[PDB]
């Protein structure tokens, strides 16, 4: 899993790969890990599909009740707070990295990370999933904040692609959604138009030279490609 969210001026992007794996087999290659909580507030789920689907459904339910009751929009902080509560109450029995991100008119776009222990941290961007370990340096090196919506979408797609090109546990599509004052725009990049992969990076086209032919010299030539 690779999930992330990034703020831009006036909203957020969420992004995720689509793969759900039972270890080394892919049970679902088109999962949707961007889960709607309210109209403009989403979570990205990582960890146990079961656990995260159960919490998201629970929180989305509570939040719809709550919106009907106060007769007004919900804040992202409220959604994060609830998520945090539930994640923390059940921290021993669930595996669950969440990101809660969305747009509310009081605070603009926000991002909260709620990692396994049930901390809740408000950030500019957040990463989660097994694939996130690959993006920390990518962000450190290549993410400048203050990006436009469209730049930010493309950057999150790149970021996911980089992650899932190295994490065996992430893969497939890249789903994104933006969340701001306007209508949510979901997007889905199929793998074969991924903005990065190792199988198409020109610096990984030359094969490692492992299968040298038997020679009278130490000079390395190439792999032996043919018997003759």
């Amino acid at each position: 899993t690779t999930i992330l969210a990034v703020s831009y001026n006036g909203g957020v992007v969420l992004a995720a790969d689509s793969r759900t794996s039972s270890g080394t087999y892919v049970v679902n290659r088109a999962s949707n890990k961007l889960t709607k909580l309210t109209k403009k507030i989403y979570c990205c789920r990582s960890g146990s599909a079961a656990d995260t689907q159960a919490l998201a459904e629970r929180v989305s339910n509570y939040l719809g009740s709550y919106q009907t009751d106060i007769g007004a929009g919900v804040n992202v902080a409220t959604a994060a707070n609830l998520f945090q509560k539930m994640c923390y109450m059940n921290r021993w029995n669930i595996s669950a990295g969440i990101i809660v991100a969305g747009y509310d008119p009081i605070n603009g776009g926000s991002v909260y990370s709620i990692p396994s222990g049930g901390s809740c941290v408000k950030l500019d961007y957040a990463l989660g999933g097994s694939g996130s370990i690959f993006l920390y340096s990518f962000f450190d090196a290549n993410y400048k904040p203050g990006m436009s919506k469209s730049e930010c979408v493309a950057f999150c797609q790149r970021a996911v692609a980089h992650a899932y090109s190295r994490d065996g546990s992430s893969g497939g599509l890249i789903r994104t959604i933006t969340l701001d004052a306007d209508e949510p725009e979901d997007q889905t990049i199929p793998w074969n138009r991924s903005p990065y992969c190792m199988e198409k990076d020109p610096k990984y086209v030359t094969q490692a030279t492992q299968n040298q032919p038997f020679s009278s010299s130490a000079k390395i030539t190439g792999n032996r490609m043919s018997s003759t």
Partner: protein
């Protein structure tokens, strides 16, 4: 002895339930609801005699869910409480089944809730008539049909084409029956309907209404969410009534 507790009288009637019906008319407000081909409207009086009261703060219209409105008529705080219960019911239902509660089910469950108060002693029946409106998806085509379900303090639940509750609910009804012999009410337009509703309200309460003395709620096939109709548009219907 039977007048004060939920046991049967010798005639086989439940006094406290009958009296709860009088709680419906006691406030002096009338409500009317009506469905047309692709919408449903509910109109209720919204009387603010106190110049110092804040009109937008008092209402008898309530979102139950985004796709179900209701209008409570009667003892206002009892209505507010039923709304809470409805809301809970609707939300427990969405959690359990993953779908928004159909309005006829919600009505039925609120009728069950009321019925209970008439059979278990020492719970006061809520003195309201609840009127849920909403759209409802059909299993054949998937098209949305508009619905009006009432629930009354006895727990009697019903679907309606048009319905009135509150003071002069009889003279309102009589007017709509009469206008149902002319036209077919489910072939009307949201305008012709609202006109009928507003005209029925006006007939019953014996006065012409202004826009700010009503509050109107609506669901439409196009936009199924339940929405307070803005005053501009109620003014235009009220103009269309005084004329034609």
């Amino acid at each position: 002895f039977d007048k004060y507790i939920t046991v049967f009288s010798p005639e086989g009637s439940l006094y406290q339930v009958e009296y709860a019906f009088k709680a419906v008319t006691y406030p002096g407000l009338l409500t009317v609801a009506i469905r047309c081909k692709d919408a449903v409207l509910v109109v209720t009086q919204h009387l603010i005699p106190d110049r110092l009261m804040r009109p937008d703060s008092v209402t008898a219209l309530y979102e139950v869910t985004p796709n179900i409105g209701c209008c409570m008529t009667g003892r206002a705080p009892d209505g507010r409480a039923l709304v809470q219960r409805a809301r809970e019911e609707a939300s427990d239902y969405q959690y359990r089944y993953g779908v928004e509660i159909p309005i006829a089910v919600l009505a039925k469950r609120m009728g069950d809730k009321a019925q209970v108060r008439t059979q278990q002693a020492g719970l006061r029946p809520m003195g309201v008539v609840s009127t849920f409106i909403g759209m409802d998806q059909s299993d054949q085509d998937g098209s949305l049909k508009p619905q009006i379900y009432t629930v009354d303090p006895a727990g009697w639940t019903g679907g309606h084409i048009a319905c009135a509750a509150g003071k002069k609910q009889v003279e309102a009804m009589a007017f709509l029956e009469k206008r149902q012999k002319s036209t077919e009410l489910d072939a009307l337009t949201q305008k012709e309907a609202a006109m009928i509703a507003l005209a029925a309200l006006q007939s019953a309460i014996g006065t012409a209404v202004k826009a700010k003395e009503v509050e109107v709620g609506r669901c439409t096939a196009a936009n199924p969410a339940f929405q307070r109709v803005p005053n501009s548009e109620v003014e235009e219907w009220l103009t269309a009534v005084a004329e034609a």
